[PDB]
């Protein structure tokens, strides 16, 4: 699926009462994708 704003994983189901994830905070840099017009 593509969206304008969300990337990742969406479980669709029922009774989700807890979601957790752990990530290492990455270095961010300027984005080079995106439009120019």
């Amino acid at each position: 699926e593509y969206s304008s704003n969300w990337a990742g994983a969406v479980l669709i189901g029922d009774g989700y009462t807890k979601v957790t994830g752990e990530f290492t905070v990455p270095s961010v840099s300027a984005g080079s994708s995106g439009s120019s017009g």
């Binding site: 593509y2 969206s3 990742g8 029922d14 990455p26």
Partner: protein
Amino acid sequence: EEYCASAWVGIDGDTCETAILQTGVDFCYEDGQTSYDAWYEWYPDYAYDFSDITISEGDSIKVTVEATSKSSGSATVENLTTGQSVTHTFSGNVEGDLCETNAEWIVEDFESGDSLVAFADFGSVTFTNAEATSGGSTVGPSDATVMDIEQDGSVLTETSVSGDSVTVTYV
């Protein structure tokens, strides 16, 4: 210009539009200034900054949202590296009830003012220990709908899942 991305976990927001219980971290880069800001949000309420947590590049962050009911829950961001943790408890008066039908690990190009924030090159975010609880089940992202950001014809992310992880890679 500012480039950000947010990585968050959340309940709802996809096929459940009424609420999102989410927490995560914004990574922003602006002209060398990188900032990481944890926040929680019980959409459609505003995101609130978790100002009481410092997030730095390289920190392992555990983000958890827990819905204690459709209208209550908590968002917790733990900085496992630094040992600092923040929780915010939503005790009702929430702006929307959860359906609890979506569980998600999301890297988001969030809105900033009248547009999506310029999407930071965050390299990759891998949510490990990516677990959603559905009743008694602990479910990983393997069966998740994989979403990627596409804007103005450009795919900005590649997302892959495994049994316990979601990797979103900036393209």
